[PDB]
């Protein structure tokens, strides 16, 4: 009756704070575990596995995970939260003494410390002479969220996060665009619960 | 092993069959052939454990399999679907769980390779608002009108490929969600410092490599035939 189960698709985590990524199973023996970390655009790489031996395995980062086969868990850890460590995560199990299966997957999103949010909404011109423009909404912080546009007319993107090396600076944003005629910067995230100080410039 | 995978990236129409080769090098008794789609991981098709030896994984229907070597393990669609678009990835074993994964088969059906297109690409220049109100400036890349969603975007700042300051969408949106072929579109940002920007020395560059039709495809249409090429837009900083 072998299984592994990891629950929410997608998940969040404070930078800086501990990181916790749920693996349970469904097996009477004692499985092999592993941890598998997909960063975007490329392969499988492993974090860590439990083979029979260390209880408490350490991995590559910082991270680490636990077997506990009295709640039958393998939950990875990682002390703190670092902006580097968005990525997909897998979960998986030893099967019929023949395979490894995979978990569905999760997804760590990891919320920036914004401490100085400047939340803005401007507009950018294309670079060729089109008046063709886009609205940009920058720099709130993570108890803002944008949604999607009630108009089907209206593009909206979900909200981004840059990471200025330069600078140590991180933000947010979102991309609104439309080809109507009617659409101004100003009404582009009406649909979205956007800060009472957002900046509206001229 | 070094396991390695063909093709990388493919396009094909509904109805054809399709072949994608695993190979290693280290002649692992155990080969297998999973693919990933989001939100289910990645589910086993087919598995062998020898040369005389395959077995069906969870997800067996429409493909076949053949273990041709001790190094080789090929994988087909028999008539290939759309609802068979994914990441295709091999794996060999050794006889402990130390599974060796290939770099991965992108791979997209498609009905109609009429309705390929490539992207227009277009970059949108920072505001002066912001460059007053922040010191920062935010460049907007918008590729659209593409189809099938099977791209990859890169910034490119005096000619070198940048990371830092980026955040492009992870999957682009439907222009058009009420349609089975919608065409896409797709956005990233590149933020610098407004010095950086109001320098007109420095040229900034969103690359859009698109993959879509091969030379060996027949098309009738008047426009461009929509093969695998890059679409780029640009912009030079500028003082005012």
């Known amino acids: 009756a072998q299984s592994v189960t990891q629950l929410g698709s997608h998940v969040s985590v404070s930078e800086g704070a501990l990181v916790l990524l749920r693996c349970n199973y469904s097996?009477?023996?004692?499985?092999?575990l592993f941890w598998y970390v997909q960063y975007p655009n490329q392969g499988l790489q492993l974090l860590l596995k439990?083979?029979?031996?260390?209880?408490l395995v350490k991995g590559i980062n910082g991270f680490e995970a636990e077997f506990k086969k009295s709640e039958t868990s393998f939950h990875l850890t990682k002390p703190s939260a670092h902006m580097s460590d968005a990525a997909e995560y897998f979960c998986a199990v030893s099967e019929q003494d023949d395979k490894i299966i995979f978990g569905k997957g999760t997804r760590l999103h990891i919320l920036p410390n914004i401490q100085n949010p400047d939340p803005a909404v401007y507009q950018l011109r294309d670079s060729k002479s089109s008046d063709k423009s886009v609205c940009l909404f920058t720099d709130f912080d993570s108890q803002t969220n944008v949604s999607q546009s009630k108009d089907s007319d209206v593009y909206i993107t979900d909200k981004c996060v840059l990471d200025m090396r330069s600078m140590d600076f991180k933000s947010n944003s979102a991309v609104a665009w439309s080809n109507k005629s009617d659409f101004a910067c100003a009404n582009a995230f009406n649909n979205s619960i956007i800060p009472e100080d957002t900046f509206f410039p001229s | 092993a070094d396991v390695t995978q063909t093709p990388r990236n493919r396009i094909t129409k509904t109805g054809k069959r399709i072949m994608l080769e695993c190979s290693q090098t280290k002649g692992h008794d155990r080969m297998y052939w999973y693919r990933q789609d989001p939100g289910l991981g990645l589910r086993l098709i087919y598995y062998?454990?020898?040369?005389?030896?395959?077995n069906k994984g969870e997800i067996s229907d429409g493909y076949s399999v053949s273990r041709q070597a001790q190094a080789k393990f090929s994988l087909s669609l028999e008539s290939a679907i759309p609802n068979q678009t994914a990441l295709y990835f091999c794996?060999?074993?050794?006889?402990?769980?130390?599974?060796?994964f290939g770099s991965g088969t992108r791979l997209t059906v498609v009905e109609d390779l009429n309705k390929v297109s490539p992207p227009e690409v277009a970059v949108f220049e920072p505001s002066e608002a912001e460059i007053s109100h922040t010191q920062k400036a935010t460049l907007v890349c918008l590729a659209t009108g593409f189809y099938p969603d099977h791209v990859e975007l890169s910034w490119w700042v005096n000619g070198k490929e940048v990371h830092s300051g980026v955040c492009t969408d992870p999957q682009p949106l439907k222009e058009q969600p009420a349609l089975n072929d919608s065409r896409y579109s797709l956005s990233s940002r590149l933020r610098v410092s407004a010095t950086f920007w109001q320098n007109p020395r420095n040229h900034f560059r969103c690359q859009v490599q698109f993959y879509g039709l091969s030379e060996n495809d027949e098309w009738t249409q008047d426009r461009a035939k929509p093969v695998t090429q890059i679409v780029s837009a640009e912009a030079w900083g500028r003082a005012d």
């Open positions: 097996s009477s023996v004692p499985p092999y």
């Open positions: 794996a060999t074993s050794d006889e402990s769980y130390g599974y060796t």
């Open positions: 062998s454990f020898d040369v005389k030896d395959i």
């Open positions: 439990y083979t029979s031996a260390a209880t």
